[PDB]
C-alpha cells in the first residue's frame, strides 16, 4: 500500500473514531486488557490534575492482574502526573 493512501485511510479512521467516541460508550475495560495484559505495561502514568485513571488501572490490576503479574515478576508503576511528579521526572529527595 502507498504511503499517501495509508495517510488517507488513517485520517478517515481517526475522524470516524473521534466522531463516534463523541457519543458512544467507552470500552475502557478492553484497553486495560490491551496494555496491562497483551503489551504487559510496566508503568501506568495518568497525565491528569487528579489520580482517577490511576485508581481504575490499580483496581483492574489487584482484581485480574494480581496472580498474572507476580508469575512474570513484572513491576507495575501506577503513576499520576498530579501526585507522583517525583517518579515520572525521577527526582527523589536525599
Amino acid at each position: 500500500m502507498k504511503p499517501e493512501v495509508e495517510q488517507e485511510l488513517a485520517h478517515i479512521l481517526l475522524t470516524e473514531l473521534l466522531a463516534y467516541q463523541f457519543a458512544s460508550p467507552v470500552r475502557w475495560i478492553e484497553t486495560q486488557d490491551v496494555f496491562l495484559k497483551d503489551f504487559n505495561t510496566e508503568r501506568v502514568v495518568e497525565i491528569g490534575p487528579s489520580p482517577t485513571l490511576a485508581g481504575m488501572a490499580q483496581r483492574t490490576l489487584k482484581n485480574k492482574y494480581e496472580s498474572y503479574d507476580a508469575a512474570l515478576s513484572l513491576h507495575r508503576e501506577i503513576l499520576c502526573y498530579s501526585k507522583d511528579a517525583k517518579e515520572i521526572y525521577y527526582t527523589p529527595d536525599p
Binding site: 500500500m1 504511503p3 499517501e4 495517510q7 488517507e8 485511510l9 488513517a10 485520517h11 478517515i12 479512521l13 481517526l14 475522524t15 470516524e16 473514531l17 473521534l18 466522531a19 463516534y20 467516541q21 463523541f22 457519543a23 458512544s24 460508550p25 467507552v26 470500552r27 475502557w28 475495560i29 478492553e30 484497553t31 486488557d33 490491551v34 496494555f35 496491562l36 503489551f39 504487559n40 505495561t41 508503568r43 501506568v44 502514568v45 495518568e46 497525565i47 491528569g48 490534575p49 487528579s50 482517577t52 485513571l53 490511576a54 481504575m56 488501572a57 483496581r59 483492574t60 482484581n63 513491576h75 508503576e77 499520576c80 502526573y81 515520572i88 521526572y89 525521577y90 527526582t91 527523589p92
Partner: protein, 792 residues
C-alpha cells in the same frame, strides 16, 4: 614492527599474512554462527548471571552484547595491521570500546549467522602518539544489528601526516527558516548549492546528511578538507527528498566553516537531558579473576601480556594485566542487574573508556549513577576504582525504559489554578499556554489562562473596534449539522450573535471554569503542556502506549501522536465543548435534565456483574421511555458510568437501591426459577421507581445511591446515545481540521488505543470491518468494499 605484526597475525589473524592493503578500503570479517555453548562459556567467563543468557526451553536464548567483540574482534584488531598504520603492538593501548544497538535492531538470537564488516575512520597522529578509531558494522539477515566502535593508541612519536586522515560522517543538523535573514544567510553561504536555485525555503526544516574527509599536513593544519552531502527538506508528508548539496572543498584549512556555523547557527538532532541530582543506584565491588585464560580462550584476544609474565615484564607493565574488556563486560553485567532490571533487551548502548591498568586478584569498586535521560532512554554513568582509591574505568550506558502506558484524565477533575506552577517553571509549559492563549485572544477574544487562574463568574466578549469584527465573524461560523429524519437541521450556536451583536456574555452559575467548553480546553491544554515538559526532559519511552478517559483521549493523541497542533487542538476541543453544551435544552443557570451515575456493580450485590446492569438499563430505558445507557466501561464489575436523562438516572438509582434493600439477584431468578418472568416482574419495579423520579422537578438534584455515585455538575450526557445526532457535524469538523499528511501511521500504529474499539491503531481490512460493525459509517463501508483498489 613488521615481525610484531606477523607474530600477532599468527596469535590473532586466521588469514594468509599480507599487510599490503588499503586501510580506507572497508574490511569484511568472516560469518560467525552464534551457538548456545559459546554464549554459555562467554557468560560464565565474564560472570553473567542474567536469565536472558540461560538456555531455557520454548523462549529464544538471548545473546550478551559483550560477545559482539568475539564475532567482530577478528575484523576490528585487523584494522591496526596496515603498513600505513605503523606501530609496536606491545605498547598498544585500548582507550575506548563502544557498542550501540541501532534502534529497531532486536538483540542477537542463538541461531544467528552474523556478517562482520569494519571500516577505518580516525587515523590521527597526536604528539603523544597515534589514535586509530575504527567502525565495525555487524549485520544479520543483511540489516545492521549493532555497531562496534573501538579507539586504539600507539604510544611514541608519529609524524606520519601523509597517510594521516579523518573520515568522520558529520551528524545531520536541522535548520528552521522562520526569518528572512536566515535564507539570506544560507544563500550567502557558497557551499549551499540547490537542484532548483528558485526553491523557496520559507517555513522549511533543512537537514544536511553531510560527511567530511580531511587530509592533514600538521597536527592542527588540514592539508585539504572535503565536507559534502545532500541537503534535504522535511516535506508536509514528513518524507525527506534531496533539494540541494553541500560540496565544500578547501586546501590549507585550520577547521571547517560549516562546523563553526553549526555551533552558533546549527541545532544538534539529539540532546541528553540532565537530572538536578544524579540518582545513586549502587557502589558494587568487582574482582578480576586469578587467570585470564577462561576469557582469552572464548574472546580470542591472545595478547600474551594478559597471561605471559615474560611478556608483561618486557612491556614495563606491572604484571599480567587483566583484560580491560573483561572488567568492562563485568561492570555492564552489574548495570544489567541493577539499571536494566535483569533484562538484556533494555540495553541500547554501552561505551567503556579504559583509564588505568588492572591486575589479576584485585578488589575494584564501581560507582554507578542514574544521571539523565535521552528520548525515553535513561543515561547511566559508572566509574570503577581500585583499592588504592584510583579510578581505573569510566563508561556511559544508554538503557531503554520498558513499556509505559499513558492514561489522560477526562472531565470533572478540573480545579482552580491547575498547572500554574509548571506554567511559571517550565519553558515548554510557558510555550504551550502562551501559544493557546495567543490563539484564543486573536480568535475568540478571551484568555483561557485568565479563566484557569481566577475563574470569572461571567466573561463578556466585546466586538468593540476592528479586532471585534474578526472575533464576531467566527462566532457565527459554528453550527450543529444535526441529523433529524435524514435531513440536515442546521442550528447555529449563540443564535443571539448576529451582524448587529456588539457584546455576548458567557454565563456560569459559580465559575465558567466548570462549563465543559472551558474545562476541555483547560484540561487538555495543561496535559499537553505537562507532556511537552516530559519530552523536554526526554523521560518518555518511544515504545509507550496511551489512552484517554472521555476528553483525555484528545489530549493523549495530541501529545503521543502530534497529529493536530496546539491551535488545531484548542479549536477542536472548544468546538467539542460548545457542541456538547448546546446539544441539550438548558435554562439561565445552564442546568439540563441529563448527567451521569458511576455505579459500583459489587456494592448492590457481589454476584451483580456488568451484564446484569446492562440488562437493568436496557429494561429501565424502554419501560420508563427515558434515555440512559452505560457510557464508560471503567473497571470490570466495580465502576460503570451511565449517562442519560436526570429522571432516567433517578429511577435507575431507585431500582438498584431497592434491589440491594430486597437482596434478590436478577441472574439467579432468570435462568434457574422461571423464563421471561423477571421481565414483567422488573417493569413493576421500574414503574414504581419512574413515577417517583418524574414527579420531582426537571432541575432535580442527583443524590448518591448505595452502588451509584452522582457525577457533580455533569449537565451533558457525554458518550450517550442522546448526542448521536451531534456526530454528523463533529465528523464534518474532524475532516476539515485533521490533515492527510499530519497523520503518521507508524507513530500511531500499535500505540494509540481508541475508546470505541479498545484495539491498538491498525490500518487493515479486519479493523475497518470491526469499526463498520460497531458503528456503520458510509466512508469505511465504501473503503472495505473498495479495499483491494487502495493497495494498488
Amino acid at each position: 614492527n613488521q615481525r610484531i605484526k606477523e607474530m600477532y597475525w599468527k596469535l590473532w589473524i586466521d588469514e594468509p599474512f599480507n599487510l599490503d592493503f588499503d586501510p580506507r578500503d572497508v574490511i569484511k570479517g568472516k560469518d560467525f554462527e552464534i551457538t548456545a555453548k559459546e554464549v554459555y562459556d562467554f557468560t560464565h567467563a565474564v560472570g553473567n548471571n542474567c536469565e536472558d543468557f540461560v538456555s531455557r526451553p520454548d523462549r529464544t536464548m538471548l545473546a550478551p552484547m559483550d560477545f559482539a567483540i568475539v564475532v567482530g574482534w577478528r575484523a576490528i584488531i585487523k584494522a591496526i595491521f596496515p603498513n600505513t598504520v605503523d606501530g609496536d603492538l606491545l605498547k598498544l593501548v585500548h582507550l575506548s570500546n563502544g557498542y550501540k544497538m541501532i534502534p529497531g535492531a532486536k538483540p542477537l538470537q542463538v541461531g544467528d549467522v552474523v556478517s562482520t564488516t569494519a571500516v577505518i575512520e580516525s587515523v590521527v597522529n597526536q604528539p603523544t602518539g597515534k589514535i586509530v578509531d575504527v567502525v565495525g558494522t555487524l549485520s544479520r539477515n543483511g540489516k545492521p544489528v549493532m555497531e562496534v566502535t573501538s579507539s586504539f593508541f600507539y604510544r611514541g612519536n608519529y609524524t606520519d601526516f601523509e597517510n594521516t586522515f579523518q573520515k568522520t560522517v558529520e551528524p545531520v543538523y536541522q535548520m528552521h527558516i522562520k526569518t528572512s535573514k536566515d535564507i539570506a544567510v544560507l544563500r550567502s553561504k557558497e557551499w549551499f548549492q540547490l537542484d532548483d536555485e528558485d526553491f523557496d525555503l520559507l517555513n522549511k526544516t533543512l537537514t544536511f546528511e553531510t560527511e567530511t574527509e580531511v587530509t592533514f599536513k600538521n597536527a592542527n593544519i588540514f592539508s585539504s578538507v572535503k565536507c559534502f552531502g545532500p541537503i534535504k527538506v522535511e516535506l508536509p508528508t514528513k518524507e525527506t527528498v534531496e533539494i540541494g548539496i553541500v560540496d565544500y572543498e578547501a586546501g590549507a584549512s585550520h577547521g571547517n566553516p560549516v562546523v563553526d556555523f553549526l555551533k552558533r547557527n546549527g541545532s544538534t538532532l539529539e540532546q541528553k537531558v540532565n537530572l538536578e541530582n544524579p540518582i545513586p543506584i549502587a557502589v558494587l565491588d568487582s574482582y578480576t579473576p586469578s587467570t585470564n585464560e577462561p576469557y582469552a580462550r572464548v574472546s580470542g584476544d591472545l595478547n600474551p601480556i594478559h597471561v605471559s609474565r615474560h611478556f608483561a615484564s618486557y612491556a614495563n607493565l606491572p604484571g599480567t594485566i587483566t583484560h580491560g574488556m573483561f572488567s568492562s563486560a563485568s561492570v555492564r553485567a552489574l548495570i544489567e542487574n541493577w539499571a536494566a532490571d535483569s533484562v538484556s533487551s533494555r540495553v541500547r548502548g554501552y561505551t567503556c573508556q579504559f583509564v588505568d591498568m588492572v591486575l589479576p586478584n584485585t578488589a575494584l569498586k564501581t560507582s554507578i549513577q542514574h544521571v539523565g535521560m535521552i528520548n525515553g532512554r535513561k543515561l547511566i554513568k559508572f566509574e570503577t576504582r581500585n583499592e588504592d582509591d584510583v579510578v581505573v574505568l569510566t563508561g556511559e550506558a544508554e538503557i531503554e525504559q520498558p513499556v509505559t502506558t499513558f492514561v489522560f484524565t477526562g472531565q470533572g477533575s478540573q480545579e482552580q489554578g491547575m498547572g500554574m506552577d509548571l506554567y511559571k517553571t517550565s519553558k515548554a509549559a510557558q510555550d504551550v499556554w502562551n501559544r493557546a492563549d495567543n490563539h484564543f485572544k486573536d480568535t475568540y477574544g478571551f484568555s483561557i489562562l485568565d479563566i484557569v487562574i481566577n475563574n470569572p463568574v461571567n466573561l463578556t466578549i466585546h466586538f468593540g473596534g476592528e479586532k471585534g469584527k474578526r472575533i464576531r465573524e467566527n462566532y457565527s461560523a459554528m453550527i450543529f449539522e444535526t441529523i433529524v429524519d435524514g435531513k440536515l437541521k442546521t442550528e447555529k450556536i449563540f443564535k443571539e450573535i448576529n451582524e448587529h451583536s456588539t457584546s455576548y456574555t458567557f454565563r456560569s452559575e459559580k465559575g465558567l471554569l466548570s462549563a465543559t467548553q472551558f474545562t476541555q480546553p483547560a484540561l487538555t491544554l495543561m496535559e499537553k503542556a505537562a507532556f511537552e515538559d516530559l519530552k523536554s526532559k526526554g523521560l518518555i519511552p518511544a515504545d509507550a502506549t496511551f489512552a484517554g478517559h472521555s476528553l483525555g483521549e484528545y489530549a493523549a493523541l495530541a501529545s503521543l501522536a502530534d497529529v493536530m497542533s496546539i491551535e488545531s487542538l484548542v479549536e477542536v476541543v472548544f468546538y467539542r465543548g460548545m457542541t456538547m453544551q448546546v446539544a441539550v435544552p438548558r435554562d439561565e443557570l445552564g442546568r439540563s435534565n441529563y448527567g451521569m451515575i458511576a455505579i459500583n456493580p459489587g456494592r448492590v450485590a457481589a454476584s451483580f456483574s456488568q451484564e446484569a446492569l446492562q440488562y437493568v438499563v436496557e429494561r429501565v430505558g424502554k419501560r420508563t421511555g427515558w434515555l440512559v445507557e452505560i457510557v464508560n466501561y471503567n473497571v470490570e464489575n466495580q465502576q460503570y458510568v451511565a449517562a442519560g436523562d436526570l429522571r432516567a438516572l433517578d429511577t435507575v438509582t431507585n431500582v438498584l437501591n431497592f434491589i440491594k434493600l430486597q437482596k434478590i439477584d436478577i441472574i439467579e431468578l432468570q435462568k434457574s426459577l422461571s423464563l421471561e418472568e423477571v421481565e414483567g416482574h422488573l417493569f413493576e419495579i421500574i414503574d414504581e421507581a419512574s413515577k417517583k423520579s418524574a414527579v420531582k422537578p426537571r432541575p432535580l438534584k442527583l443524590e448518591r445511591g448505595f452502588a451509584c455515585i452522582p457525577l457533580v455538575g455533569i449537565s451533558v450526557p457525554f458518550h450517550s446515545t442522546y448526542l448521536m445526532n451531534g456526530v454528523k457535524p463533529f465528523k464534518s469538523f474532524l475532516k476539515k481540521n485533521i490533515i492527510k499528511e499530519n497523520v503518521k501511521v507508524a507513530r500511531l500504529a500499535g500505540k494509540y488505543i481508541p475508546n470505541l474499539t479498545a484495539k491498538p491503531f491498525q490500518v487493515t481490512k479486519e479493523y475497518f470491518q470491526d469499526v463498520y460493525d460497531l458503528t456503520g459509517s458510509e466512508p469505511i463501508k465504501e473503503i472495505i468494499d473498495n479495499w483491494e483498489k487502495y493497495e494498488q
